[PDB]
Amino acid sequence: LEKLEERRAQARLGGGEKRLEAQHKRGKLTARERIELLLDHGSFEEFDMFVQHRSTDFGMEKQKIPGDGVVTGWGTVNGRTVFLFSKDFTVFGGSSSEAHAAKIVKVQDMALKMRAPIIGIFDAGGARIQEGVAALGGHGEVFRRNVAASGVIPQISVIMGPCAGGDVYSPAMTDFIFMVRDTSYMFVTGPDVVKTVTNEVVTAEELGGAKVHTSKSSIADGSFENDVEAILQIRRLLDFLPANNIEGVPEIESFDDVNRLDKSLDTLIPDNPNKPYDMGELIRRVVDEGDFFEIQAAYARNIITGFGRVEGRTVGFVANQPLVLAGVLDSDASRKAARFVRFCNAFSIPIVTFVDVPGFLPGTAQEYGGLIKHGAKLLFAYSQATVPLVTIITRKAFGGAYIVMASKHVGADLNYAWPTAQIAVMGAKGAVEIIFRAEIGDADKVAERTKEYEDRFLSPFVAAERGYIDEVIMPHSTRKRIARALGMLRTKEMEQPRKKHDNIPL
Amino acid sequence: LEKLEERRAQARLGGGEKRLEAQHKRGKLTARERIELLLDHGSFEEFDMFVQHRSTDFGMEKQKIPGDGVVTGWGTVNGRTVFLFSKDFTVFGGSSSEAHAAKIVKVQDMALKMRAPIIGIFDAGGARIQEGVAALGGHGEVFRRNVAASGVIPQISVIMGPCAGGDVYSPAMTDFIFMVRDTSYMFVTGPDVVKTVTNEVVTAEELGGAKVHTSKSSIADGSFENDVEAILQIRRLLDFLPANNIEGVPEIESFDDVNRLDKSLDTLIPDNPNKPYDMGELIRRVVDEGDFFEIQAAYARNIITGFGRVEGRTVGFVANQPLVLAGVLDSDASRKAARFVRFCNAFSIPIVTFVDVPGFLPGTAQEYGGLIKHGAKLLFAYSQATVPLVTIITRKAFGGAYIVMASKHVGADLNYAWPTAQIAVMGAKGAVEIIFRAEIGDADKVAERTKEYEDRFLSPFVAAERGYIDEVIMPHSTRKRIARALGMLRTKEMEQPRKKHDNIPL
Amino acid sequence: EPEGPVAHRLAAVAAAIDHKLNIRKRGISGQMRDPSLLTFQRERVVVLSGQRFNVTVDPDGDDLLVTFDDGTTAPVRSAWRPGAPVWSGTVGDQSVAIQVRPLLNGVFLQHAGAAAEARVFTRREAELADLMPVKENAGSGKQLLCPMPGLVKQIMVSEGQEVKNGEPLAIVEAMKMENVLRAERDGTISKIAAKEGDSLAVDAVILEF
């Protein structure tokens, strides 16, 4: 019947032509256009197009809009099944009602049941005030499902407009949050309340924009220039990730050779111990085809985290970066690395770690901020892990930092070292000062003792003699060795002791 | 033979009588005196009394001290098996070496194997420099085992002297850290390097003293006046805790009655809503015999966390405290409550929660500091729990904060409310200003609308009509209800979905 | 920017690259049903630094055939592999080498002294991309603040000198590691506040354009 086509075409207009045009004028796409761009052509099946709200307070009974402000369903991305929901800002500001939340709950349940990923797209303003406590209940149920899915299916969130109030806690419990520059923001309490309570005058962008959440607050995993770019990059990310915690990583045919050498790496490390180099260069010369997907690039830039491929299989990478803060570990970097390691372990992704670390960041600000526990987080993550772990020391590895960065002693499978490695309890001069404390008066004698200590102990060979390092390798062979190791390690079988859950510091 | 008695007596002197008298002059006990005070009389069995070190560098072969700086063994506390180690500050400054670490590893392995608690007493200075890289290796083997035991057996740490460098990460991964005032301190990096790098001039007490770690940094769960008080309180605490994650909470015979009414509670809440009350008094009136062991008392005092008993069985308590920051939720309070809920759930301890919360703390400082994620931590911990949860709303419960505080929507078994409960999306003034914004010019209609909203919605009865509240009870019945419900809920049986582990935000 | 037969060539190459990658991408494991049951759209839109080309792509056995709106065709042949920095091959009876670099959702191409950013869409994706607005950068101004506390070890510029974006200006040392500060904008050096030997705190003034 043509009448059903009419009903459908009327549901497809949301909250009016003029609100849609106002959305296009801000530079934003609509909910349905976003879905259309994310999914493969012709694959989208929609749920609950005709659902309506049932509130009768404050005159709500006179405006019943089909769909109640959210679009829900499932489709395919590059042939693989995905579930999704997309909020509609033109329908009561995207606010969440009882029926709204019921739709979201339906798709969450289905995604967990069929063990497939779920993508949320956010543009909205929280609980619908007119529906009072009812609205809140809805939020709660959604929250519950998030927690149930944590570590079973990947959950991705994409902030493409306002996200205020309770809404924010749903993305917070997902594995990745991405944001669009200049049109999105997140906060718990808004500017007016900030003014009435704290007398601070701030705009929405200044309080909760993409810069703040990608560079200062730890919340976001990345930003993008506009909606189209963001969605295309989400398509890119999904092709790296497993569908669930059972099936393993996806595999594609590679154009690269796993037996190629790279002479350039033999010159990467400078002769001067105080000149830096770019670890990213090494990461991009090791991965297949130079392709690397960085996570939290703008935050805690003394450490690098991301995804690449070796032999057509997804691998995760963690590395110290000498260009920033001399590569020291601090609380921000430790948190950034710890959550990445935990995700990869949950979904059976192998991890490679490149180590060049002189110690931790000193000062009252680190200690009063809780560096003890924050740095314990990364140690916990690595020591808990049962996926393959491969580590490479290019340069300095001093003190407890050496233990933390995927050492043999916390459970790493293979540990290599370049010829330029310096594995020691601390630098030479400090060690000598402590050992020869009663004789720190003379000068030439101090230089002699320091020379001797450096010649004996600032090298890879004491570690090799004890078996803490499996092999000292030439730089130009790094890829060749990595690719071989990972292959052999694909059969690793290991388990932690039986428990409800660990008690990791928070 | 008398020669064996001689060898034993000699090993019992550590680094010398002079160093032990110096330890005493500082106001501190010796390691062996600490063991003697913790354990039941005659229960201590010591391991590895005669172990020595094997280093041959920097003249260390000529001072071989038996024990290598730690006393290890097992005994009983109030009849129940415990394992323990205690560092000896008189022997190489309590520094950690290979043999030292192996001693600690032995008792860690035994504690996990026999599923019993482990207590570590720290007075030391980290990796023994003269042993070099080997020392670090030892540290790693300890760290690993800490992680293996998390959530399987309770691990307690007692800091009774200096604790610096790599050492500090072992206590960090344990369940509780207690400190002795004026004689203990913890930091990753010491004042000398702080001065060299940052130009700050600070004392050890000012950098990592008990005040810092009990009131600012979130590291310590409590402090005590002296060694003796600390050790007696550790005995007390062990009497609350389960031995392992299977056996369940201990039981004692109670002197209280489960059917007594408390008329005082009928007048606890003041008529004036802008006036506070002490929630700790309600806690101390609901538990058996007024006995309550508070955790992290000096940190984030807007929230209360601790242990009591009901009908002779251990119960955990969480509550909002109106006397501090109007009882709002903030990042610090969120993390404090989250770790406690996680521990309780891991070890099968039921949780009772008291709710009086107006919302979250506003400001740029909270948002830039990551309140979104820090606040999600508590929601996550509650939504994951499978132990019994009982909740009582005394007063205000607004917005997302209502959801976070053990709401029916996040899986609470029983939810009660006092007659004074105000369960609503927000306050009346703000609700009307948002709803009736097109007529905000007037002032009389404003007050009329405000009063009608107040009367209709700021009460417990809409939540009761929807089934979100199981019963509106009288205050004087609170204990009587709790004790009954817990008794019924002992048989609860629930399971989260199958996974390696969750991906809770960090 | 490119114009005339040059631009065309570049456009064709872009299409080819896209095609190749897409083919590989459709062999991913774990799909719901078989990919042979899918379809590839022939009509494509190549956007080349603000210049659109409507094209049609067809696989000629092993090579590719790219048809434009003018009816003019171009066969494309090469053995390029993703990762190599030079695309060498033939585009319609002519041998060419293009310098290829990766770009977010596209490539950056250089040929015959011309350079262009190249993106390839379908019709619908292109019309949705045309809804996105062009944004302008704010632009740094007037200052060079020290982002890290440390010592000033060298200054390579002098007052009254002109610099171009990305040029080094000073070196700051902290925790035994140098740090090169580079110019973020083009301009002329007006003043120098600090010079070799002095310690600077975070967000301190080194110079002003």
Ligand SMILES: CC(C)(COP(=O)(O)OP(=O)(O)OC[C@H]1O[C@@H](n2cnc3c(N)ncnc32)[C@H](O)[C@@H]1OP(=O)(O)O)[C@@H](O)C(=O)NCCC(=O)NCCS
């Ligand atoms: C989400 C938010 C940041 C967007 O602000 P904005 O872009 O300036 O736009 P508006 O305030 O015009 O919001 C768009 C519409 O959605 C409605 N809306 C927004 N948030 C809503 C919510 N939680 N409940 C119900 N309706 C809501 C608006 O009232 C408005 O509809 P209108 O066109 O009929 O007036 C802001 O509205 C907000 O804080 N909302 C959450 C609840 C709240 O506290 N709002 C008012 C305090 S300022």
Ligand SMILES: CC(C)(COP(=O)(O)OP(=O)(O)OC[C@H]1O[C@@H](n2cnc3c(N)ncnc32)[C@H](O)[C@@H]1OP(=O)(O)O)[C@@H](O)C(=O)NCCC(=O)NCCS
């Ligand atoms: C733990 C610490 C904070 C306690 O400091 P303190 O109370 O002033 O006391 P001391 O430094 O005199 O320590 C007592 C002894 O332990 C020894 N010691 C301490 N830490 C040691 C370590 N890591 N390795 C070997 N010996 C160590 C000291 O040499 C000293 O020996 P002595 O009486 O024969 O001289 C401190 O010594 C320390 O920071 N040690 C770690 C190693 C280090 O970085 N030291 C340099 C700065 S102190």
Ligand SMILES: *C(=O)CCCC[C@@H]1SC[C@@H]2NC(=O)N[C@@H]21
């Ligand atoms: C020499 O000048 C000593 C300063 C360098 C010490 C550095 S700071 C970074 C590492 N942290 C630490 O504790 N020591 C190392």
Ligand SMILES: *C(=O)CCCC[C@@H]1SC[C@@H]2NC(=O)N[C@@H]21
């Ligand atoms: C009246 O003066 C309005 C401002 C006070 C509101 C308080 S601040 C603490 C709670 N958080 C919140 O958002 N509102 C409550």
